[PDB]
Amino acid sequence: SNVRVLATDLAFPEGPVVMPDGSVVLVEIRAQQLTRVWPDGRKEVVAKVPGGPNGAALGPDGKMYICNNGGFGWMPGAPAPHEYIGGSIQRVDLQSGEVETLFDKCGEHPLKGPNDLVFDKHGGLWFTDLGKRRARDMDVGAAYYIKPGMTEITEQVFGTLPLNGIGLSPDEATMYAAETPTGRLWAFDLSGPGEVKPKGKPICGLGGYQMFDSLAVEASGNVCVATLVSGCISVIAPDGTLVEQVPTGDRVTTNIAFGGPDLKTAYITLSGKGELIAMDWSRPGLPLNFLNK
Ligand SMILES: C[C@@H](O)CCC(=O)O
Numbered sequence: 001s002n003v004r005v006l007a008t009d010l011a012f013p014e015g016p017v018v019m020p021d022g023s024v025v026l027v028e029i030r031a032q033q034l035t036r037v038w039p040d041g042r043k044e045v046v047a048k049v050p051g052g053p054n055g056a057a058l059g060p061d062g063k064m065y066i067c068n069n070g071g072f073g074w075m076p077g078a079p080a081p082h083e084y085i086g087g088s089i090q091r092v093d094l095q096s097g098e099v100e101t102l103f104d105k106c107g108e109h110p111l112k113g114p115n116d117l118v119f120d121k122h123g124g125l126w127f128t129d130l131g132k133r134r135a136r137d138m139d140v141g142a143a144y145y146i147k148p149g150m151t152e153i154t155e156q157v158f159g160t161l162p163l164n165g166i167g168l169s170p171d172e173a174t175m176y177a178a179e180t181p182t183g184r185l186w187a188f189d190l191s192g193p194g195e196v197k198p199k200g201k202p203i204c205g206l207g208g209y210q211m212f213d214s215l216a217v218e219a220s221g222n223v224c225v226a227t228l229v230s231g232c233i234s235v236i237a238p239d240g241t242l243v244e245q246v247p248t249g250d251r252v253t254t255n256i257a258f259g260g261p262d263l264k265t266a267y268i269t270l271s272g273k274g275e276l277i278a279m280d281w282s283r284p285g286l287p288l289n290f291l292n293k
């Protein structure tokens with residue numbers, strides 16, 4: 001595990017997407033932008049994304065899809081009314097910087113705090129809703145699926161505590177969602193693309209005072225979840241076994257993504273230190289659709 005710092009002075013980094021050349025496109029939630037970090041050290045702003053760009057994934061159209069949580073109040077906190085512009089799913093052209101909003105509601109219900117997302121092999125898009133915190137109450141968590149072609153958005157999970165990381169098993173027959181305040185990883189069986197069958201179960205619950213953020217799946221099927229408070233990556237087997245916890249040095253470790261040769265480099269956002277780091281990983285990551293395969 002040779003650790004290296006790839007970038008500093010990032011304004012709450014999140015949603016790393018590791019390109020084939022080893023460059024990383026990621027979101028800076030606090031600076032409200034999409035940023036490109038190159039291996040020669042240089043950084044460039046790809047696009048300004050007003051609000052709270054929270055997670056990213058490359059899509060079948062070659063554009064970067066974004067979970068926009070609508071904005072926080074800044075370490076993040078509950079957004080004062082004016083700092084919140086509504087949650088949405090957006091799309092950014094990595095060549096012009098043009099930002100287009102795709103969805104801001106599901107049925108008659110506005111999206112609250114979209115957080116992270118993952119494409120299935122047909123181009124359907126899964127994403128989590130962390131909800132928003134208000135003065136005396138908070139939204140419940142949810143997970144949504146947007147049908148291939150961006151034709152329809154559907155509610156698949158609703159009424160958990162806030163949901164954060166999301167991924168698919170290698171065979172894409174199981175969707176995983178990380179429940180933030182409980183440090184529980186939930187597994188949902190899929191009867192087919194975009195459709196949960198009964199709605200799921202927690203396969204791992206960490207002890208103590210540990211919370212979950214975003215995640216990435218390994219080719220083995222293990223789920224690697226950024227773990228807040230204790231500051232590590234929690235590696236969870238498909239059967240829920242806690243395989244290991246890899247310390248990162250930051251209590252606010254938020255996301256992980258695999259890249260490099262054989263997808264055996266882990267790229268991790270340390271959102272407390274404002275850093276993007278890379279780390280040797282003993283096993284290869286799961287190739288993401290429309291990025292790695
Ligand atoms: C720390 C989280 O609960 C909020 C932002 C994030 O998804 O990284």
Ligand SMILES: [Ca+2]
Pocket residue numbers: 014054055115116164165213214254255
């Ligand atoms: Ca997240």
Ligand code: NA
Pocket residue numbers: 016214215216255256257
């Ligand atoms: Na990730």
